Design a protein around this ligand. Structure first.
Ligand SMILES: Nc1ncnc2c1ncn2[C@@H]1O[C@H](COP(=O)(O)OP(=O)(O)OC[C@H]2O[C@@H]([n+]3cccc(C(=O)O)c3)[C@H](O)[C@@H]2O)[C@@H](O)[C@H]1O
Ligand SMILES: Nc1ncnc2c1ncn2[C@@H]1O[C@H](COP(=O)(O)O)[C@@H](O)[C@H]1O
Lengths: 649, 340, 339
C-alpha cells in the first residue's frame, strides 16, 4: 500500500466551483466549465459541482424558452461530454433540458465521456424574486430516461451515483431550493445510501442569505451524516434585478471543510478531502439513522444506483484538510474557552448531584501538587460553594511516601492535613518479604488511608485519574489510585486538563492568591513516557473511541497533524520551546504501544470503574457508557495492521 | 444398479453442528479453527457444517465489533475460507459481522465449493438482560436484495432457501440464535415454504436452565416444522468478562434427538448425524394441515428465493450415523418402555 | 377589539420549562411540574413543555421497568390531569407509560382536565452513552388509542393538537432524538399543518452538544416555517455517568426568541410570544413548502387532528418579544457590520 495516498486512506477529493457566467451563451459557459474541470483534474479531484443552470445562465428568464438557446445548450453539453473522456472527476453541470412537454432545470452528471444521469430540480420557487415555474417544470416524481445526444440515460429525482472502486463515495444531486423544503430529496437519498450530497445553486445574494445557506447546508450535512458540496452562481449573471456572490462551500457532518471568497473577481473553487470513513463510522454507530431508513423503506428502496469506476490517482497528492493536533483541545480560542466552560460545569454539576444525594458528606482527596488532583480540588470547592457547604468540609491530604499542594489548600481554606505513609509501607513490604510492587504498595496505601478516613469522617473519596490514564491503563488497579467513590476527571483527557486550569485562573473567581498558586502548579508541572507523549496518545484515543479507525489511518492523520510544527495552528498556551514535531517512526512507535495497551492490557481496569460524568463529544471510557469491550482480548490484529501498512519511518 | 450400502442413495443427508475454538478479536485464528473442523466434516462425507453465531469475530466482543481493523480482518478471513471451500464437500454456514449499507449485520455466510451462496442476517436482536445486540448491529428482518462480498453480488436476506439440485429432500434455511425464540420465527415460515433442514448459529451465553430452554425450542421447532434442526453454540475462547459459555451442539429431527455433544468441553466438538430426508418427506406427505397452513400464509411463503447448488455427495459406503432401533414398537430405554 | 392584547394580534405565549428532577419519585416531579405550570398559567401561557421522561426521570435505566415505579408514574400523571382543570396552558409532560407489551417513552399532552393525546418517541438511541431500546419500545408506526385512567385517548406519532379558537396554533410533539434523524416526525407534521413543534429532551450535556442542539432546533424551525420549543433535563438527573445542563429554548423561523441559563441552580423557564401570523405569512408565500406537502400527500394526510378550546386571556399581558425599531438596521453591531 502507498501510505502517503489520501485515496488509499478513504479520502475523496471534492470540488465546488463557481465559473464565469456568460448569460445566453452556452459555448462560453462550457469553456469556463472546461477550464475549471481541467484544474480540478490536475488536483486529483473526484467530483466538481457547478452552479445552477451553468450552461445557460440562471438569470435569463424567458430567454430559457428560446429555441436557439435550448439548442446551443445541447451542443455545448455534448462538447463537454466528449471532453470529459480525458478528465478524472465526475462533473455535475447545470442545464435547461427539454424532456417530454417542457424544459427541466437539471443537473447533468458526466463522467469519462458519458452522461451517467440527469437530475431535475424538484421544487421551483415562484414567489418574491423567483419566477421558476413560469419557464420550467417540477422534476419531483419524474423517473425513467431522457435522450441526450443519441443515448438513453437515467432521468429523475431517484438517482445515486456509486463509485464501484470507492464504496464510501455515493453521490446524490439536488438543486438550490431542493435543500430548503421541510423534506428535501437529499435526506431521503442519504437514508438510501448517499454519502456525498451535491447542490447546484443560483441563489441571488440578499442581506442575510449567506447565513441561511450555511444554516441549511450545515444542518443537512449533520442530520444526514454526509458531505454537502454547494456551489452558487457569481459574476456574469444578469443584474437587471439581482446581485450574485459566487459563494462555494463544502461541509462534512456539520463541520466546514472549505469555503471560497464571496463576491470574488474571477472564478473560485473550494477543494477539500472528504473523509468517507468518518461518515461510514458515524452511520455505523448511530442506529437510529438506519431505523429512520427502515421506517421510510418504500421511499428509500426505490433509488436507482448508477455505477461508475473512478480510478483515482494512487500516489501522494497531499491532504487538503485541516487535521488539528489536539482533537480534545480546539486551536480556536473562542472555541477552547467554550469547551473549558462546558468541561468544568460538567465536572462540578456531576459532583454536586452525588453530594446532594449522599446528604452532603465531607469530601476526601489526596493532593500531590500535580495537575490532576489540583484541578480536582478546584472542582470540589466550586461544587461545595454552589451547594452552600463550608469549604472546611473538604478534607485534603498530603500523603508523602507539593508545597503547591499545601499552599493551594491554605489559599482555598479547605481542611488540610498530612499523613506520612512510609512506616505503613515499610511494615507492608516487610510482611510480604519484599519495581512494580514497591511503587504499588505506596499507591495502594494512599487509597487505603483515604478510604478509611472517608469511613471515619463521613466523607467520600474523590478520584482524580484522567481519561488518558484510563485509556492507557496507567494507574494502580483496585487498591490504588484507579479506585474512588466518585471520579471527577475520569472523562477529561490529560491534554485538556492544563487548559481547564488556565481557564479557571483567567476567569479569576477564586481570587488572586489561588490564581498565583494555580499558575505555579502550571509552571512547575509542565517541565511516564514509557507510555509516550500524551499529545499523541490522546490523538489516537479520539480516533479509536469516536470512529474506530484502523491503525494505519490513525498514523496517517497524526503524521499530517504533527509532523511539522510550523504548519497548522497551536491552541493558546504553547510557548515555542514546547511545540514539538514528531516523525513517522515516532508516531508509529507510540501507536504500537497505544493499541497494545488500549485494546489488550487496560480494559480490566476500566471494567470496574467508579462513577463520574462523561465530558467530551469524543466519548468517555465507562463500561456502563461509551465503551463496552472484553477484559481478556489480544491486540494482535491491530499490531499486525501496523506492521503491514505503516512504513518504518 | 444402485449402491445398497450408501446412506446418500437411501435419502440420508449427513449434517454437522460444530463448536470451534474462539479467539476473540482474531478472525484469521477463528477461520483456521473453522477450516480444520470443515476438513474433518469433509472427511466424514458431511453435506452441511453449521458453526456458532459471529464465528469469525467472536460473539462476545461488544463495541470491538465496530472497529475498522476488526471488520477488515473478518472480510479477509471470510474470503480465504471461501477460497479453501473449493475443495470441501460440505456447505459451510459461518457467522460474521458484515457491513452492508449503513450498518453491520450479524450474519451467517453460506459457503459452498468456492462461492458464497447467500448471506443471512439475524432478524431479532436481543437488547435486554445480558444482551446488548442492537447497540452494535442492525436487525435483518425485512432486508432483501444482495450484498457485495469480495467482488460479487450475492443474495442477502431473511428469505433465502438453499436447495440441493441433486438431493431434492435437502432444502436449507438458516436463522440465528434469538430468531428461534420469538412467537413467529423465520424458520417456521421457511419450513412452510419448503425448507427441510433448519440451521441455527448460536452464541448463547450459558446460564442455569438455559440448556433446557434451548432444547425445548429447538425440539418443538423440529416437531412443529417437520424438519431437521441443526444447532451450534459458542464455547471456549468467548470472553468471560461477564458470561460463560458451554459450547453445546445438537441435531434434532421431527422431535427426536439425533446427536448432541459434550457441554463445557475441553477442545472442539462436533455433532454429526445422518438426517433421513425421506422420513421428513413422508410426514409432510401425510399431514395435510401442514400444507393448509402454508396456503393460509401464501404471500409470506411464496416470496422465498431459492438458491440452487449441486452437492455431489460420496456414492460409497460411509456407514450410517444414526441409531436404528431393532423394535420400532418396543423402546430400548426402560423408562420409555414402561411409559409405553 | 382590545388593541393592547397580544392574543388578539395573533400571538401565542409559549413556555419551555426545566423542572427539578427527583429520580425514581413521580409525585415529587409532579409537584415541581405543578408549581411551574401554575407560574406558566399566571403568565398567560398557552403551552408548557417539560423535559423527556419528566415524571420518572430520564436517567434511571432499568428502574423504569419496576412495577412500583410504573405505578407511581400513572398515579402522579392522573393527579396532574386533575389539577390541570384550573390551568390555562396545554401541558406537555414526559412519562414512561405501558401500552400493549412494553413501555413507551411518551409525551402526555394535557389540557383543562383531560388528556388530549399521548405521543411516543419514535427513535430510541442505543449507542455511545444511550441505552434506550433496552427499556423502551420505538413508537414509530404506532397508532390507535391508549387507556389512561379509565379513558381511551389518542396514541401515536401522527397527532396534531389544534386550538379551535386560535387557528394559527397547531401543536405537534416529538421527543429528543426524533429531531436528529434525516427525516424527523416534526418535518412531516409541519407539512401537515403544525405551526408549533415541541421537543421534550433528556440530553445529557457533553462538550459541544449545546451547539448541536441549537443547530438542529434552529434549522428545524427555519426549514419548517415553525416555532420550535425545546426543554432539556437539568438538576436532579443521575450523575452516575452523565451531567445535565437544564437548557431551554424557543426558536421561530430561524430566530431565537428566548433561552434560559445553562447549568442553573433551581428551576428555569423560557417564555416568549410566538407570532402565529408571521408563520402564517411565510407559509402563505413560499409555494414550494405546499408543493413539498403535495409530493408527500399520503404521509401528510394521515394526521389525526385533536381539537381543543384554549380561551386565552383577553386583556393586556404585555408582549414577551424583542421588537427592533429598525427592521432593516440590526441593533447588534456585528450583525449590522455584516449587513
Ligand atoms: N486482564 C486482567 N484481568 C484481571 N487481572 C489482571 C489482568 N491483567 C493484569 N491483571 C492483574 O492486575 C494487576 C496489574 O495491574 P496494577 O496492579 O494496576 O499494576 P501495573 O499496571 O502492572 O502497574 C502499575 C503501573 O502504573 C504506573 N502508575 C501507577 C500509579 C499511578 C500512575 C500515574 O501516573 O498516575 C502510574 C506505575 O508506574 C506502574 O508502572 C496484577 O495483579 C495482574 O495480575
Ligand atoms: N506524594 C504525594 N502526596 C500526596 N498525595 C499523593 C502523592 N503521590 C500521589 N498522591 C495521590 O495519588 C494520586 C496518583 O498517584 P501517582 O500518579 O501515582 O503519583 C495523586 O494525584 C494524589 O491524589
Amino acid at each position: 500500500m502507498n501510505f502517503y495516498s489520501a485515496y488509499q486512506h478513504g479520502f475523496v477529493r471534492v470540488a465546488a466551483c463557481t465559473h464565469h457566467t456568460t448569460i445566453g451563451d452556452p459555448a462560453a459557459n462550457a469553456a469556463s466549465v472546461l477550464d475549471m474541470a481541467r484544474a480540478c483534474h490536475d488536483d486529483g479531484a473526484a467530483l466538481a459541482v457547478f452552479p445552477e443552470l451553468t450552461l445557460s445562465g440562471y438569470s435569463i428568464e424567458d430567454v430559457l424558452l428560446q429555441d436557439s438557446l435550448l439548442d446551443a445548450v445541447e451542443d455545448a453539453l455534448l462538447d463537454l461530454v466528449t471532453e470529459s473522456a480525458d478528465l478524472l472527476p465526475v462533473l455535475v453541470v447545470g442545464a435547461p433540458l427539454r424532456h417530454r412537454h417542457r424544459i427541466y432545470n437539471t443537473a447533468v452528471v458526466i463522467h469519462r465521456g458519458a452522461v451517467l444521469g440527469v437530475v431535475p430540480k424538484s421544487y421551483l420557487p415562484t414567489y418574491r424574486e423567483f419566477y421558476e415555474r413560469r419557464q420550467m417544470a417540477p422534476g419531483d416524481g419524474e423517473r425513467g430516461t431522457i435522450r441526450i445526444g443519441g443515448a438513453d440515460v437515467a432521468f429523475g429525482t431517484d438517482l445515486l451515483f456509486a463509485a464501484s472502486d470507492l464504496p464510501g463515495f455515493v453521490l446524490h444531486v439536488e438543486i438550490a431550493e431542493d435543500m430548503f423544503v421541510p423534506m428535501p430529496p437529499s435526506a431521503e437519498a442519504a437514508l438510501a445510501g448517499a454519502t456525498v450530497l451535491a447542490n447546484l445553486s443560483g441563489s441571488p445574494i440578499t442581506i442575510g442569505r449567506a447565513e441561511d445557506r450555511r444554516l441549511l447546508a450545515r444542518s443537512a450535512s449533520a442530520r444526514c451524516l454526509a458531505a454537502y458540496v454547494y456551489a452558487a452562481a457569481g459574476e456574469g449573471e444578469s443584474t437587471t434585478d439581482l446581485a450574485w456572490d459566487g459563494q462555494t462551500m463544502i461541509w462534512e457532518n456539520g463541520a466546514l471543510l472549505a469555503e471560497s471568497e464571496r463576491f470574488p473577481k474571477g472564478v473560485r473553487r473550494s477543494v477539500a478531502d472528504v473523509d468517507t470513513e468518518l461518515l461510514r463510522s458515524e452511520r455505523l454507530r448511530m442506529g437510529t439513522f438506519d431505523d429512520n431508513r427502515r421506517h421510510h423503506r418504500e421511499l428509500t428502496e426505490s433509488f436507482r444506483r448508477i455505477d461508475f469506476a473512478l480510478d483515482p490517482p494512487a500516489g501522494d497528492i497531499g491532504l487538503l484538510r485541516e487535521v488539528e493536533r489536539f482533537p480534545f483541545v480546539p486551536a480556536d480560542p473562542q472555541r477552547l474557552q467554550q469547551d473549558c466552560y462546558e468541561a468544568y460545569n460538567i465536572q462540578v454539576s456531576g459532583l454536586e448531584q452525588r453530594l446532594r444525594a449522599l446528604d452532603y458528606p465531607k469530601v476526601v482527596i489526596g493532593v500531590s501538587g500535580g495537575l490532576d488532583s489540583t484541578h480536582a480540588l478546584i472542582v470540589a470547592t466550586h461544587a461545595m460553594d454552589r451547594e452552600g457547604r463550608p469549604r472546611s468540609d473538604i478534607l485534603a491530604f498530603a500523603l508523602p511516601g507539593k508545597n503547591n499542594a499545601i499552599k493551594l489548600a491554605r489559599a482555598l481554606g479547605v481542611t488540610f492535613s498530612e499523613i506520612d505513609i512510609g512506616d505503613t509501607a515499610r511494615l507492608m513490604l516487610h510482611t510480604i518479604g519484599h519495581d512494580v510492587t514497591f511503587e504499588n504498595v505506596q499507591a495502594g496505601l494512599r487509597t487505603d488511608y483515604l478510604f478509611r478516613i472517608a469511613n471515619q469522617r463521613g466523607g467520600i473519596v474523590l478520584g482524580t485519574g484522567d481519561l488518558s490514564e484510563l485509556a492507557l491503563g496507567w494507574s494502580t488497579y483496585g487498591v490504588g489510585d484507579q479506585m474512588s467513590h466518585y471520579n471527577v476527571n475520569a472523562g477529561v483527557p490529560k491534554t485538556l486538563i492544563q487548559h481547564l486550569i488556565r481557564w479557571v485562573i483567567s476567569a479569576g473567581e477564586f481570587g488572586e492568591k489561588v490564581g498565583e498558586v494555580l499558575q505555579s502548579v502550571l509552571d512547575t508541572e509542565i517541565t511516564e513516557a514509557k507510555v509516550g507523549p500524551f499529545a499523541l496518545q490522546d490523538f489516537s484515543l479520539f480516533q479509536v473511541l469516536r470512529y474506530g479507525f484502523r491503525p494505519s489511518k490513525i498514523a496517517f492523520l497524526a503524521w499530517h497533524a504533527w509532523n511539522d510544527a510550523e504548519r497548522g495552528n497551536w491552541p493558546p498556551g504553547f510557548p515555542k520551546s514546547e511545540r514539538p514535531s514528531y516523525s513517522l517512526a515516532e508516531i508509529r512507535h507510540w501507536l504500537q504501544i497505544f493499541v497494545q495497551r488500549f485494546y489488550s492490557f487496560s480494559q480490566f481496569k476500566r471494567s470496574a470503574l467508579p462513577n463520574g460524568p462523561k465530558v467530551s463529544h469524543g466519548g468517555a471510557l465507562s463500561p456502563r457508557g461509551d465503551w463496552r469491550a472484553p477484559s481478556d482480548m489480544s491486540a494482535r490484529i491491530w499490531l499486525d495492521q501496523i506492521d503491514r501498512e505503516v512504513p518504518k519511518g | 444398479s444402485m449402491n445398497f450400502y450408501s446412506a446418500y442413495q437411501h435419502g440420508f443427508v449427513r449434517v454437522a453442528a460444530c463448536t470451534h475454538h474462539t479467539t476473540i478479536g482474531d478472525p484469521a485464528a477463528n477461520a483456521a479453527s473453522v477450516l480444520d473442523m470443515a476438513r474433518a466434516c469433509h472427511d466424514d462425507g458431511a453435506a452441511l457444517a453449521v458453526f456458532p453465531e459471529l464465528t469469525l469475530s467472536g460473539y462476545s466482543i461488544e463495541d470491538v465489533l465496530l472497529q475498522d481493523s476488526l471488520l477488515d480482518a473478518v472480510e479477509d478471513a471470510l474470503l480465504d475460507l471461501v477460497t479453501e471451500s473449493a475443495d470441501l464437500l460440505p456447505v459451510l454456514v459461518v457467522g460474521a459481522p458484515l457491513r452492508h449499507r449503513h450498518r453491520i449485520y450479524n450474519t451467517a455466510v453460506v459457503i459452498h465449493r468456492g462461492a458464497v451462496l447467500g448471506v443471512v442476517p439475524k432478524s431479532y436482536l436481543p437488547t435486554y438482560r445480558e444482551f446488548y445486540e442492537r447497540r452494535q448491529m442492525a436487525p435483518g428482518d425485512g432486508e432483501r436484495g444482495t450484498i457485495r462480498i469480495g467482488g460479487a453480488d450475492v443474495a442477502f436476506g431473511t428469505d433465502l432457501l438453499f436447495a440441493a439440485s441433486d438431493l431434492p429432500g435437502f432444502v436449507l434455511h438458516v436463522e440465528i440464535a434469538e430468531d428461534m425464540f420469538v412467537p413467529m420465527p423465520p424458520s417456521a415460515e421457511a419450513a412452510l415454504a419448503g425448507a427441510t433442514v433448519l440451521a441455527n448459529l448460536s452464541g448463547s451465553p450459558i446460564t442455569i436452565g438455559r440448556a433446557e430452554d434451548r432444547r425445548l425450542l429447538a425440539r418443538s421447532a423440529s416437531a412443529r416444522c417437520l424438519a431437521a434442526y441443526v444447532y451450534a453454540a459458542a464455547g471456549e475462547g468467548e470472553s468471560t468478562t461477564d458470561l460463560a459459555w458451554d459450547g453445546q451442539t445438537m441435531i434434532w429431527e421431527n422431535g427426536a434427538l439425533l446427536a448432541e455433544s459434550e457441554r463445557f468441553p475441553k477442545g472442539v466438538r462436533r455433532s454429526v448425524a445422518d438426517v433421513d430426508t425421506e422420513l421428513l418427506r413422508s410426514e409432510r406427505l401425510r399431514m395435510g394441515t401442514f400444507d393448509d397452513n402454508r396456503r393460509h400464509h401464501r404471500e409470506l411463503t411464496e416470496s422465498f428465493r431459492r438458491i440452487d447448488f449441486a452437492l455431489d455427495p460420496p456414492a460409497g459406503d460411509i456407514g450410517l450415523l444414526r441409531e436404528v432401533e431393532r423394535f420400532p414398537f418396543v423402546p430400548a430405554d426402560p423408562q420409555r418402555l414402561q411409559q409405553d
